[PDB]
Write a protein that binds this DNA or RNA. Structure first.
Ligand SMILES: [Zn+2]
Ligand SMILES: [Zn+2]
Lengths: 188, 189
DNA sequence: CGTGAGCATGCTCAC
DNA sequence: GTGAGCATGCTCA
């Protein structure tokens, strides 16, 4: 997808380095099922009060783009809910008291929204912890299809203020697969 | 709880083997998902009328024996129904007009019973076609746990007249895995 | 119909 | 827990 730093210079950042690892040249996150991944939110200017941060997954390949990304039938019933996220949601937020799990009434896409909070004292960014509740390979779900996670900064009214994204692969061996995908990578 | 021929010499045989292939030394059937496997029903003397044949799967390993063998959530919902077999049943019967899919309300175990039919003209055994609707590897299902299929010959009152059983591995490459398991089995020293 | 090599990807098991 | 190697479904010459 195409980014939109917008008027507040909004963009993501990732801690360097397993259970979670980010590849810059690929701008792809590799992580294990249900493991927390910290994502940094950077702005050049403080967003208006009441701004929100939304996370959503969409299939990368054009031919799958219209299909809603949801958990596979096995994990959807594996009883591992936190009492807040609906079972069919792939993406969950950890360490936040006000998550909102939504489903678009038109597209039926799932998303989890959290309030935007300015960086703590001494920091240049604010961190949000995300979890993916299915592997990219789960049958009846992502089915080995790569996805993109779209992080959008919106105002209290739900208007787009900024947007960024990264590709993600939820798998058993993040470190192994990242290396495999980086050496198989061809540029131009 | 043990194979046994009974008053009718009831035992199983298998057309010999790939899609579907049996290994005598292993007494194990290696087949592909949803592919028909013909198993032969042998008897020393014809059993009474009203006799039926039931098929049931159970996990081989003791620490799994108590868990019901059923289809994984993905396949249970993958609309491949045939209009009769409940969607969660692993074993289905092919080419038989009236199979009966039951679920023991006490053990919750699935089984499919079919009426017993004497061999055709010029044959010594009767053949029943089964097929498995999940791979042994299905996550949420057998999850790589080996199962045993138990075929029982019972009369119209449900009384056991004989029993037999074989191991089964439903997989993508039956020939590759049969060879591997037979190779590994030879290592009994 | 019918072949076979290599790989993708969750799992298991020594050090 | 850390790297090696296996188990097992899929892709495609
Ligand atoms: Zn899943
Ligand atoms: Zn299955």
């Amino acid at each position: 997808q195409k980014t939109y730093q917008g008027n507040y210079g909004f963009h993501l950042g990732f801690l360097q380095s397993v259970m979670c690892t980010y590849s810059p040249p690929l701008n792809k996150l590799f992580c294990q099922l249900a493991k927390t991944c910290p994502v940094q939110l950077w702005v050049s200017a403080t967003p208006p009060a009441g701004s929100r941060v939304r996370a959503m997954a969409i299939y990368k390949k054009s031919q799958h783009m219209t299909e809603v990304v949801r958990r596979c039938p096995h994990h959807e019933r594996c009883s591992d809910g936190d009492g807040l996220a609906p079972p069919q949601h792939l993406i969950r937020v950890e360490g936040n008291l006000y998550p909102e799990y939504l489903e678009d009434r038109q597209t039926f896409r799932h998303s989890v929204v959290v309030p935007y909070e300015p960086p703590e004292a001494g920091s240049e960014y604010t961190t949000i912890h995300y979890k993916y509740m299915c592997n990219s390979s789960c049958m009846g779900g992502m089915n080995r299809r790569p996805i993109l996670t779209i992080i959008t900064l919106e105002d209290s009214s739900g208007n787009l203020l900024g947007r960024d994204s990264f590709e993600v692969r939820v798998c058993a061996c993040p470190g192994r697969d990242r290396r495999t995908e980086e050496e198989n990578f061809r540029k131009k």
